[PDB]
Amino acid sequence: QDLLLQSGAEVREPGASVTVSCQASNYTFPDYYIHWVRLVPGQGLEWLGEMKPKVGVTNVSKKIRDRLFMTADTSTDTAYMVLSALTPGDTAIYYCTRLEPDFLSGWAHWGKGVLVTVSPASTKGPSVFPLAPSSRSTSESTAALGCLVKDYFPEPVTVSWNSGSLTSGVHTFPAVLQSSGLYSLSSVVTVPSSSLGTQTYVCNVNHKPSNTKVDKRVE
């Protein structure tokens, strides 16, 4: 039941060598195999490798046998996985698996898998704008608020409206790669035309490593 610990993400240049690391629960830790599974975006999951830290050994996918290395620190069973010559194609979420002394005849549960991402990109705070921007005129009933995030890196971003004082009818589109390797995102709020023709509205946006806030007031 109780979960392995596995921490947060990193972002990288191509051809590099890059690592993820993972740790035992309220648990004994040399005693059973470890498995590494890659969750690749838009695609089915992928087994890389079995490992046993006790001897410092593995069984390995023939798709690799070259770029990987794996073990754990026997002082903590702090698992390490090392990958090398990283392509943008390797941009994925990596999941640290135990194996369960009976249930491994099928499988076992994991800790929290971690993202890593590969691109020639570098940090940018977003460019930001209104969208909707107001109905200049329509069949007034509802319309929406809207704001743009663009030219941005890396994803994710944090966003809210009237500092998140507003919550109902708010939506946030999942991110899109611009061909430069930057990101765009957007947020929108469907709202009554009476309310829109009355109150002041702002889209409130934040991220690190851009260390940047924007609070775009809209009409």
């Binding site: 023939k62 249930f103 005849s105 099928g106 898998g113 809207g146 589109f173």
Partner: protein
């Protein structure tokens, strides 16, 4: 190399219903003994998968009521007796076979809904974004079902250049509908190279095609 066909590739269904999923393979599915075998699991919002079958018929301890399936080797298939809102996500099966081993591609599960058109919007680029030299405008399609709408754009009444990209929400938490953003991108000079900018739509919840536009210099 070991085959795993998992199907339906996607599924949408109403609450309380029966539903079933099939896994097909090239062989028998053991690390040894003649006797270790397949397992099935559910993945959602970035948590690891949650195990459901351990070993063909073997239900995972403490899990739901029966998703349980049947078959052997080249054949297996789950069935759940009742759709719960909990159940939406990705389902996949794994073989209990000697490794190296490979996932089959995964099966999408969703709630089914009455068909419903989006509310639809487009607008001029904000003028700061215009004089940023690279520019964009957005066709927005709030709250609709299913996400099998299709979206188009015309500039001076003639179809777009293809300088455009799109994104959809998750299945809505409660309405189980969706929204869509389509974005068209311009330089400021491409934004001069046409005058009226339009987006056009056809969808299940549309009785007929829909059109919206703005024209610049307004």
């Amino acid at each position: 190399e070991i085959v795993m066909t998992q199907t339906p590739l996607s599924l949408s269904v109403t609450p309380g219903e029966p539903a079933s999923l099939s896994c097909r393979s090239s062989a028998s599915l053991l690390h040894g003994n003649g006797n270790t075998y397949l397992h099935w699991y559910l993945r959602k919002a970035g948590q690891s998968p949650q195990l459901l079958i351990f070993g063909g018929s073997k239900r995972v301890p403490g899990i739901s009521d029966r998703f349980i399936g049947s078959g052997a080797g080249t054949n297996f298939t789950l069935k759940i007796s009742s759709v719960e809102a909990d159940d939406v996500g990705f389902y996949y099966c794994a073989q209990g076979v000697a490794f190296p081993w490979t996932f089959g591609q995964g099966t999408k599960v969703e709630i089914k809904r009455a068909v419903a058109a989006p509310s639809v919007f487009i607008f001029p680029p904000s003028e700061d974004q215009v004089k940023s030299g690279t520019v964009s405008v957005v066709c927005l399609l709030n709250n609709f079902y299913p996400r099998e709408a299709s979206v188009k754009w015309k500039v001076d009444g003639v179809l777009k250049t293809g300088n455009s990209q799109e994104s959809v929400t998750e299945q809505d938490s409660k309405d189980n509908t969706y929204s869509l953003s389509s974005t068209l991108t311009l330089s400021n000079t491409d934004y001069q190279s046409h005058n009226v900018y339009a987006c056009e739509v056809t969808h299940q919840g549309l009785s007929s095609p829909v059109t919206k536009s703005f024209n610049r210099g307004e």
